[PDB]
Each structure stands twice: as structure tokens, then as C-alpha cells.
Design a binder for this molecule. Structure first.
Ligand SMILES: COc1cc(SC)ccc1C(=O)N1CCC(Cc2ccccc2)CC1
Length: 333
């Protein structure tokens, strides 16, 4: 058990192993209580996150367990995972704080891109990495559901990891409260991000929820007969038929001057019917990514057991399960 020290940052008390030095807050609170630090063991800069009130209630405790389990499972170059997890507690009874450590990327996509058009090569590199991480996440039978620039951790060299208005990147089926959705809700977000990197403009900057849907449907058209046949709710259908009916735009007339392969990929990502939307693995094989695609280096995750989500346990049970996961953590090589 290492020597811990205490430090106060932004009125938060941190107790961390002496391994982690030069703590300084990062993210201005957007990502919770997070500090950058120097990892004396590796010479790398890391982000340390102090979980907030992890065992105050059953919901917090199960959330803590959820977050630790997920981050422990995610082992991929383009997904945030764990370099370390620790607690100053020396026993389960003492256990009341959880710290997580990962590589410090230090910016989100928007801080790196600054709403400029990127070159087509630069867009290929960024979107390729999002899709490579998404293929991994999706292979674990996980859906992100809120992919957007601020959830992409990106360094100055545009190396990117997925972190597991706010509404500009959300799939229409989520906006429309459809009860079933599939992993390609995330591919919708990717398409929105790719469009914005190419054009320098948010694709669907709706003023509010309704406007958002109107901007989406103007580009992708109102639902075709094949999609309408899959909507179980008469009122939802009546709702959809209530809207102004619009044919789909030809994206070649929207993304003027883009690489035709990018437009083609966007067409396959921004399909209204999410059953017809390209998956992450299919997108990685698309000719747009020929310079980056390596089918033998786009790894998938081990099966991820989420059955705890269906359980109703007591606080001390979630806390003990979380302590077990702290104890069993094995750092990456
Ligand atoms: C979008 O990413 C950033 C954005 C910024 S300013 C917009 C600054 C820093 C990062 C950055 O490097 N983060 C990575 C670490 C994240 C917290 C965490 C710690 C440990 C374990 C899991 C998670 C926060 C985000």
C-alpha cells in the first residue's frame, strides 16, 4: 500500500498515492472532479477523477459500480479506460472514495477543431478513430447514446478516445422517443460530427427540440413507407404524418466540394431508418478510410456482462461489489 498524501484543489480534498504528483484541476468541472497529474511511475500525464459521493445511496453506489465495471472492461486505443483505480481506504468499512486514473488527453474535439473545416485527410483520421472505438464499444453490446464533441477526448495530435447544444448530435429516433433503438444511434452522431468537421458548421443546430427534428427531417426526408410500417404507435404515426412532409435531399448538393466518398459515407450514416444505417464495422471498411483501415487492427471487446443492471441490491452490497473491483484491478502493461 503506497504512501498517500492530501491536497485541496477547488475546495475538494484529494487523497492520492504519492505516485501521482503535480495535481491541477482540468475540464472546469465539465467531467466531474478531475485533476491532471504527473504519474511518476510512467512519466506520463494522467487524469485522475474523484468520484462524487459514491456510496451515499443505492443509486449512487450502483452508478459507481457501473462506471468502474465499464471502465475496467474498456481496453482499446480509442476508448477511455483505466490506468489505475485506488482508494485511500484500507478496508471495506473505511471504503468511501473511489479514484480513477486514465491517460490525460487534455481537450475535447471542439477545443482541437475550433469549428474550422479540416482537410479531408484530417477528417478521415478523426472519424476513423471514432468508428474504431465505436466498433469496440458496440461489440461489448454497449451503446454510447450521447456521442458528441465534448465526449471525445482528443490531444493536439488529434489522437482520440471516446469518453463513456447538447442535442445537436442525437439520433432522430431518440428525439422522437421511439422505444426501440439500436447501436447505430451512435453512428448518427458520428455522421453529424463528420459533417461538421468537413464543413465547419454544425449540421443540425436546432434552437429547441422541435426545431432540431425539423432540421433533421429536411435533410433526411420524412419517413418512407417502409419505415412507417415499423412504427407501432398510431399516435406516433399520426404525429409523424402531422409534420411537414419533405423528400430527402441529395447529400452531394449539401456537402458541396467534399470528397465524394465522404458524401457517400454520410449518406449511409445519416439514414433516417436506423435499421438501414451503416454499422461501425461496416463504416470502417468503407473506401473513405482506405488509408487507415486495417481489418486486423480494429479489435473487438470481450463479452461484457451487464446483468447487474437488472438487480436491486442494498447499498452495502453495491459498495462491496465495487470494493471487489477495486481490489481485483490489474493495470495495463
Ligand atoms: C474530453 O476530454 C477532456 C477534455 C478537456 S477540456 C474540454 C480536458 C481533459 C480531457 C481529458 O483528457 N479527459 C480524460 C479523462 C476524463 C476523466 C476520467 C478520469 C479517469 C478515468 C476516467 C475518466 C475527462 C476528460
Amino acid at each position: 500500500r503506497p504512501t498517500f498524501y492530501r491536497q485541496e484543489l477547488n475546495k475538494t480534498i484529494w487523497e492520492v498515492p504519492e505516485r501521482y504528483q503535480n495535481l491541477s484541476p482540468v475540464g472546469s468541472g465539465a467531467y466531474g472532479s478531475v485533476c491532471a497529474a504527473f504519474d511518476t511511475k510512467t512519466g506520463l500525464r494522467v487524469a485522475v477523477k474523484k468520484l462524487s459521493r459514491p456510496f451515499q445511496s443505492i443509486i449512487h453506489a450502483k452508478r459507481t459500480y457501473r462506471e468502474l465495471r465499464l471502465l475496467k472492461h474498456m481496453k482499446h486505443e480509442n476508448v477511455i479506460g483505466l490506468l489505475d483505480v485506488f482508494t485511500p481506504a484500507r478496508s471495506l468499512e473505511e471504503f468511501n472514495d473511489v479514484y480513477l486514473v486514465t491517460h490525460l488527453m487534455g481537450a475535447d474535439l471542439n477545443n482541437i477543431v475550433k469549428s474550422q473545416k479540416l482537410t479531408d485527410d484530417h477528417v478521415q483520421f478523426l472519424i476513423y478513430q471514432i468508428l474504431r472505438g465505436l466498433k469496440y464499444i458496440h461489440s461489448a453490446d454497449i451503446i454510447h447514446r450521447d456521442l458528441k464533441p465534448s465526449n471525445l477526448a482528443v490531444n493536439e495530435d488529434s489522437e482520440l478516445k471516446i469518453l463513456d447544444a447538447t442535442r445537436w448530435y442525437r439520433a432522430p429516433e431518440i428525439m422522437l422517443n421511439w422505444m426501440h433503438y439500436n447501436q447505430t444511434v451512435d453512428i448518427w452522431s458520428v455522421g453529424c460530427i463528420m459533417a461538421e468537421l468537413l464543413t465547419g458548421r454544425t449540421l443540425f443546430p436546432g434552437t429547441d427540440h422541435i426545431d432540431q427534428l425539423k432540421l433533421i427531417l429536411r435533410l433526411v426526408g420524412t419517413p418512407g413507407a417502409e419505415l412507417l410500417k415499423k412504427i407501432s404507435s398510431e399516435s406516433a404515426r399520426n404525429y409523424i404524418q402531422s409534420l411537414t412532409q419533405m423528400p430527402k435531399m441529395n447529400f452531394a448538393n449539401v456537402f458541396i466540394g467534399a470528397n465524394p466518398l465522404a458524401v457517400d459515407l454520410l449518406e449511409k450514416m445519416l439514414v433516417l431508418d436506423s435499421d438501414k444505417r451503416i454499422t461501425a464495422a461496416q463504416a470502417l471498411a468503407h473506401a473513405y478510410f482506405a488509408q487507415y483501415h486495417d481489418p486486423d487492427d480494429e479489435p473487438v471487446a470481450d463479452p461484457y456482462d451487464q446483468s447487474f443492471e437488472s438487480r436491486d441490491l442494498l447499498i452495502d452490497e453495491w459498495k462491496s461489489l465495487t470494493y471487489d473491483e477495486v481490489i481485483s484491478f490489474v493495470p495495463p502493461p
